[PDB]
Amino acid sequence: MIFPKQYPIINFTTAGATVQSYTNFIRAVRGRLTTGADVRHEIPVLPNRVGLPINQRFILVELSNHAELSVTLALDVTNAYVVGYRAGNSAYFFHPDNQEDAEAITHLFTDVQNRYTFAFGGNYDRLEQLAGNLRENIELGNGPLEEAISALYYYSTGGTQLPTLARSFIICIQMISEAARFQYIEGEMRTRIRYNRRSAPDPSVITLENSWGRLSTAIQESNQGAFASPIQLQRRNGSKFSVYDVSILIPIIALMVYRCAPPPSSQF
Ligand SMILES: NC(=O)c1cccc2c1-c1ccccc1C2=O
Ligand SMILES: [Cl-]
Ligand SMILES: [Cl-]
Ligand SMILES: [Cl-]
Ligand SMILES: [Cl-]
Ligand SMILES: [Cl-]
Ligand SMILES: [Cl-]
Ligand SMILES: [Cl-]
Ligand SMILES: [Cl-]
Ligand SMILES: [Cl-]
Ligand SMILES: [Cl-]
């Protein structure tokens, strides 16, 4: 048997944030997401969801800000993605895709008075619609993150519009989940922090985000790194190009979702 155990907690604050504090935060996220024992083409693979002990399924990210408010995000270790959050006496979860995932989230934030699962999932297509803006028009950086934290904090008490909540999720997901998944996106956020800049992601970032699952599959199914079919990405100017091999992505992608295929049939 395995006894229940508090999930790992990683902390970040926008108050006095630096390139170093952000870098150390993303390092901590990647470290708590991975075992270090499953690494393919120098890129860590996340734990497999199937049969994963519930104590190992999630990590918590506690976010604080200049307003002296705090919220805690839950990340799914199997895909690095935000599944919900807690603030004060309330927790909110994105709609799970299946009954196994719905059961898993019952182990999160089990001390809160009020638990709610949204009807909607946390996918960008839906969140962008709710926000009323595409990712290409939602600024990222320490300023946006500061205000996103406050929006999440005040949601339960009626302080936050649905579009603002959705926009705030979009900000947090990219600055935390996508930054953990991609050194390239971490670098994008580091540069914003370095210059106290706010700016929306360019097509290179957006296409990487969109392609993360496909890239994970392509890399893990590759023949000594060579892809079985190319993956299309975009340059910063939006121009399309194809990737055929893991080599070019080793400095770009930091985590992959676990992939496997069942055996071929062994009987007629
Ligand atoms: N527009 C917002 O991000 C927002 C939504 C709900 C509550 C708050 C905010 C917001 C933005 C900037 C400073 C403070 C706050 C405040 O706590
Ligand atoms: Cl438990
Ligand atoms: Cl500061
Ligand atoms: Cl629940
Ligand atoms: Cl928890
Ligand atoms: Cl949805
Ligand atoms: Cl999407
Ligand atoms: Cl838009
Ligand atoms: Cl903004
Ligand atoms: Cl911009
Ligand atoms: Cl290539």
Swiss-Prot record:
A carbohydrate binds at residues 9-11, 16, 51, 142-147, 196-198. It catalyses: Endohydrolysis of the N-glycosidic bond at one specific adenosine on the 28S rRNA. The active site is at residues 81, 124, 178, 181. Glycans are attached at residues 11, 237. A deglycosylated form may be linked to monoclonal antibodies to produce immunotoxins exploited in cancer treatment. However, a point mutation should be introduced to eliminate vascular leak syndrome, a side effect resulting from endothelial damage. Changing residue 75 to A/M: No effect on the toxic activity or the vascular leak syndrome. AMP binds at residues 81-82, 122-124. Acts as a glycosidase that removes a specific adenine residue from an exposed loop of the 28S rRNA (A4324 in mammals), leading to rRNA breakage. As this loop is involved in elongation factor binding, modified ribosomes are catalytically inactive and unable to support protein synthesis. Can inactivate a few thousand ribosomes per minute, faster than the cell can make new ones. Therefore a single molecule can kill an animal cell. This is Ricin A chain. It comes from Ricinus communis (Castor bean). The chain holds residues 36 to 302 of 576 of the full protein.
